[PDB]
Design brief:
part of a larger assembly, 7 chains, A mainly alpha (49), B mainly alpha (140), C mainly alpha (121), D alpha+beta (166), E mainly alpha (86), F mainly alpha (118), G alpha+beta (184), B: 140 residues, mainly alpha, 7 helices, 45% helix, E: 86 residues, 47% helix, 7% strand, elongated, RNA-binding, Large ribosomal subunit protein eL13 (chain F)
RNA sequence: UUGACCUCAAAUCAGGUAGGACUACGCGCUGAAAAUAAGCGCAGGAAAAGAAAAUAACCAUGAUUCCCUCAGUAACGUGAAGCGGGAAAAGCUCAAAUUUGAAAUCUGGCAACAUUUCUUUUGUUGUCCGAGUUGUAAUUUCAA
RNA sequence: AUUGGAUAUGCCAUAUAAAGCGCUUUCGAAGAGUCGAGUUGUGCAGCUCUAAAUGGGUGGUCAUCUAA
RNA sequence: AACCAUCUAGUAGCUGGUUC
RNA sequence: GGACAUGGGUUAGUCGAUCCUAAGAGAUAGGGAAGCUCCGUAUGAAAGGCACGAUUUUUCGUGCCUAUCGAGGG
RNA sequence: CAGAAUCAUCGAAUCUUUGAACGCACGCGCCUUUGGGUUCUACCAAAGGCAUGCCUGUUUGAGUGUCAUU
């Protein structure tokens, strides 16, 4: 039972792990709520909600 | 012989006679109405296809052919007719889009599709330049 | 021979009593057979013994149609009223469930279905 | 995603962490019943990749078998007999000790509307899939009975093809 | 037939005590009183006490078994549990 | 010389398959009974001088011939994600196999989906 | 007192953990955040609770009726939860503070988390009990939470808390996290 | 003092499902004096196999099954396989990458509304409870 | 009397969307008590030990395939 | 140990018969 | 004729069984077994009900006690 | 011998005791409701119920299992 040895985590890794860019999803208003909204409007127009 | 078949041999219950057999069970044609009119309910399918001018198969026939002696135009005009009737693939703009592209064009000129894309307030949806032109040409 | 179309437009308790009557003569008719009877009476046993069956069939048809209407448009209905086709038919996938496709499989046959074409010659 | 870390942590089966957990867990299971249901997979990545989703209809059972055929193959057939209304999807190794090997067995309900309506596990509802484990159709079944594409893997021999115009 | 046992009919059968009526309906005392208040339910003193108490002597309140069995199918009893759920 | 296979059903298997051909194309009339296969070279020294039908046209054969993978299976042109053109000879023999096919093809129009608004 | 087979199982298992020589990576999940900072951490967290499925509908109907008659916003600020989602955030260095449930059942799930958060330099703490973290997000249980970005109004409060977690969790212990737990 | 959960129960709890039969052909497992018989388990109108951790050594082939041929050859009296000709052809789905500007997903209860081999069948819509972030949808499957 | 699939035509339709293909100054996750080594029972299985990432498998340095 | 149906038309160097 | 033909005849609150256990069989809890199956029945089983109370937050508090078949018994 | 049919067809029913066989055994009970009697706190009858393994959900819980509440 030796003391815990950190041969990798003793340093802080500055760059993010992933290199891929940020897709425009995370800057534009949600598309998924838009499907919900337009389905919600349709029921209101057709008299379901 | 089996008890099961001896049951209805020594039983009094009439069989379930099912009348099914047809010599030359040449299946009649459904699907296309043009071919169904001009089918020959006697001749074989490979004769009928060659009679109409339709290639039964594009690949070589793995046997013999038939040597007894030592519609396609209709399908063509029908085809181009339907392509003409269902041709207007162009789509209009919904009232939202009608305002959506108008506010972008009323402020970024009309041809600077790279500038409208970079806009953060009016181009809220972050539509790329290729779709901005698509919405533009769709307006006219 | 009570006609069934006459019976089936009666009332429930009206059919209940006629059944109560129909037991009596058939009970009496058999009594005369063991004590000795004529040919006409002996033949009349069979007709009455079917006339009980006709009435009882009419009662059940009325009673079950009441349950069928009372249970019309409910999620769960009595087992004696449901479909009885085959144990395997009942446990097999419904056509709606067999018809189900993933959203990916709905895009594939939407934009790229099977075409109708023709090879010229 | 953590399922990357978990899988690379399940490779080291004798490190300080795994050794402690194996002895700690193998003790827990040996107090519990031989075939006992699990409230969740003890390996949420291995079960994940074999066809388990955290949704109603998917059932995890844990079973121990003595050491000394194939243990994974017995784990299927013993649980497939235990929950006789449930289909056997897959199974995996969770732990072992000097006497037993422990497995978890992924089962699905053919009778559940959340299963009967999802078109990625609709197939197992079909009648042909009754008791797959009893017929060598699970992965351990297909591997064991030589089912495999390659050169490594009866009536065609001892018959006479006595044709008509011979 | 067998020798019929004591207290299998009559005043030892219809008359049922409060504690038994609790465990027959599966209720706590406070709910039992509530459904006794809402319905028309009241103790009825048997003519022969020790006969009606399986030979016991202690003072106990009694109810008609017919009365308790009516409370078994009362639809409001469910609305007591639905409030325990709520 | 135990259990024997005797071929008294050979003439009835000949017709069973003929009727299956008759039943099939009658369901899909205008289109041929079979797909187009490529022409490929057998993989040996006893057979590399002959040409025989392949399994389908590789990704590059259709890309040069002018059909994408998705629309090539609809109009009846099987694809072969395994096979690949190691020499320009096989590419040209099969590119012009699809060229004559796409010339002899009459793709009938389908039904469109036209929403009331845009 | 004959115990049930499962009461005996619960208690023997608890005794077993304190007796064995726990590995260091599992030993750190026994020395956790104190109580005063725990309520302070959750005081902030309970500002950024994600809206419930009840609120997410009542809001979206309001837009629907606005569209249905006649008719844009700011980024929704809330707390990030979910193991895969959070583990990605640390790696993408989008997380400001990570709170790790102390008692996750298969400990494989979070055993690597303190090392990873240390590796990317994300200030982390091991908060007591998952059900506390569950109620913040309106769930039965959360294996891990993470604060990724707060409004400017509470930016000062988060900075104050982060320095406390540094001083009370990581400044303390630290060395004790590298010793085999248990053996008592 | 009050509550979250975790695990474990109980119920004539609400709704469901399993068993036994037939067994010509199917898939296992066990096994004699042939991988046979007998034994054991399990299915369907077919089963199994199946979209290469595959051949080959070419100008290369291209899931599986089946027929002919290979061939009584090769290898070691047993007894192949590839290629070759045919029959038929159809491809695909997950796990592993953050929906994070929004669990977008689903079972169930009730309420309605339709539909029906069908008053027996099958769903949609709303609504409440739950399932689920220890991961349900959308997206992707290496051909990318 | 039930029905299969097409055709014509009517009525609704969430299209604020979804999909194919050019292009890339960006990236490309890929299944472990399993492969495998030693021995034992008749390719698989048991025991003992136990992996890797241009890695691994299978063929003749190349070719081919990408298991669990 | 006996019995039963299978393997099974088990095993023949041998006995008996084998048709105008 | 015990043959066949054709009919008739066994009446129970108090007589017996049904009620009980013995040796043992024996399901279950469990555990083996590739498997038909095997062991196990006191076994590391949450294994059966009683009373009290103006009703207790109008959401139950407090207190007590610890299978089954099988013919001489009735 | 003394709208028929010792008919056909078959989409509606009936389907005794059993048997996987399922309240317990190879006769004995329990549960809910309903009824009867020129007999009504007794008796009797009737209809409908009570097998085990498992799954989803539900309700009632157990725990010196985990933790919280100035």
């Amino acid at each position: 039972y030796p003391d815990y040895d950190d041969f990798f985590t003793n340093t802080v890794r500055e760059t993010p792990l992933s290199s891929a860019p940020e897709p425009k999803r995370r800057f534009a208003p949600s598309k998924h709520e838009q499907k919900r909204i337009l389905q919600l409007a349709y029921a209101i127009r057709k008299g379901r909600i | 012989a089996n008890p099961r078949q001896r049951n209805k041999q020594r039983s009094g219950k009439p069989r379930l006679t099912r009348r099914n057999a047809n010599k030359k069970a040449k299946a009649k044609i459904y699907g296309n109405f043009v071919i169904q009119q001009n089918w020959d309910k006697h001749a074989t399918l490979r004769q009928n296809y060659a009679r109409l001018g339709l290639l039964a198969t594009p690949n070589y026939v793995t046997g013999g052919v038939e040597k007894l002696y030592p519609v396609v135009r209709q399908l063509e005009e029908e085809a181009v007719k339907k392509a003409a009737r269902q041709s207007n693939k162009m789509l209009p703009l919904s009232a939202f889009e009608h305002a959506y592209i108008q506010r972008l064009i009323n402020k970024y000129g009309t041809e600077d599709f790279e500038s409208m894309a970079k806009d953060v307030k009016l181009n809220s949806k972050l539509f790329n330049g290729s779709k901005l032109k698509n919405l533009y040409i769709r307006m006219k | 021979a009570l006609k069934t179309f006459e019976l089936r437009k009666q009332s429930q308790e009206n059919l209940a009593e006629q059944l109560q009557e129909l037991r009596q003569e058939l009970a009496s008719l058999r009594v005369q057979k063991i004590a000795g009877g004529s040919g006409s009476k002996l033949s009349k046993i069979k007709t009455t013994r079917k006339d009980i069956a006709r009435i009882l069939t009419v009662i059940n048809e009325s009673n079950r149609l009441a349950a069928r209407e009372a249970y019309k448009n409910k999620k769960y209905i009595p087992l004696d009223l449901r479909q009885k086709k085959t144990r395997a038919i009942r446990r097999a996938l419904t056509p709606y469930e067999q018809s189900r496709k993933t959203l990916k499989q709905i895009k594939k046959e939407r934009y790229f279905p099977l075409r109708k074409y023709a090879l010229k010659a | 995603g953590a399922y990357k870390y978990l899988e690379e942590l399940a490779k080291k089966k004798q490190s300080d962490v795994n050794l402690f957990l194996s002895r700690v867990r193998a003790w827990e299971y040996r107090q519990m019943n031989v075939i006992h249901r699990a409230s969740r997979p003890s390996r949420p990545d291995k079960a994940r990749r074999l066809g388990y989703k955290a949704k109603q209809g998917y059932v995890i059972y844990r079973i121990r078998v003595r050491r000394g055929r194939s243990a994974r193959c017995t784990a299927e057939e013993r649980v497939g007999r235990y929950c006789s209304n449930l289909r056997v999807l897959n199974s995996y190794w969770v732990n072992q000790d000097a006497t037993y090997k422990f497995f978890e067995v992924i089962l699905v309900d053919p009778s559940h509307k959340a299963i009967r309506r999802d078109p990625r596990i609709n197939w197992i509802v079909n009648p042909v899939h009754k008791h797959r484990e009893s017929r060598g159709l699970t992965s351990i079944g297909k591997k064991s009975r030589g089912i495999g594409k390659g050169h490594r893997f009866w009536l065609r021999h001892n018959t006479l093809s006595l044709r008509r115009y011979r | 037939a067998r020798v019929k046992q004591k207290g299998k009919a009559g005043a030892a059968r219809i008359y049922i005590t409060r504690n038994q009526a609790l465990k027959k309906l599966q209720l706590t005392l406070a709910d039992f009183r509530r459904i006794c208040i809402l319905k028309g339910v009241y103790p009825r003193e048997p003519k022969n006490k020790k006969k009606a108490n399986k030979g016991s002597t202690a003072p106990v309140t009694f109810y008609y078994t017919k009365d308790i069995q009516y409370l078994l199918h009362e639809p409001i009893v469910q609305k007591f549990r639905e409030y325990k759920v709520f | 010389q135990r259990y024997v296979k005797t071929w008294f059903n050979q003439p009835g298997r000949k017709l069973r398959r003929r009727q299956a051909r008759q039943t099939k194309a009658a369901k899909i009339a205008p289109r041929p009974v079979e797909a187009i296969r490529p022409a490929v070279k057998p993989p040996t020294i006893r057979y590399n001088m002959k040409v025989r039908a392949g399994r389908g046209f590789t990704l590059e054969e259709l890309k040069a011939a002018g059909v994408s993978r998705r629309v090539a299976s609809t109009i009846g042109i099987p694809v072969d994600h395994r096979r690949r053109n190691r020499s320009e000879e096989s590419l040209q023999r099969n590119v012009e196999r699809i060229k004559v096919y796409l010339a002899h093809l009459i793709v009938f129009p389908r039904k469109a989906g036209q929403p009331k608004k845009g | 007192v004959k115990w049930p087979e499962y009461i005996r199982l619960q208690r023997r298992r608890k005794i077993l953990n304190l007796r064995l020589k726990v590995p260091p990576a599992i030993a750190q999940f026994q020395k956790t955040l104190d109580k005063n900072t725990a309520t302070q951490v959750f005081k902030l967290l309970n500002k950024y609770r994600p809206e419930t499925a009840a609120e997410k509908k009542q809001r979206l109907v309001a837009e629907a009726e606005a569209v249905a008659n006649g008719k844009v916003s700011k980024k929704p600020y809330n707390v990030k939860y979910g193991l895969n989602h959070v583990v990605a955030l640390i790696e993408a260095k989008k997380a400001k503070l990570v709170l790790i449930a102390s008692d996750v059942d298969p400990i494989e799930l979070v055993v690597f988390l303190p090392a990873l958060c240390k590796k990317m330099g994300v200030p982390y703490a091991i908060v007591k009990n998952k059900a506390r973290l569950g109620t913040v997000i309106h769930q039965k249980t959360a294996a891990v939470l993470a604060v990724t970005e707060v409004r400017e109004e509470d930016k000062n409060e988060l900075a104050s808390i982060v320095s406390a977690v540094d001083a009370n969790f990581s400044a303390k212990y630290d060395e004790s996290r590298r010793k085999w737990g248990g053996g008592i």
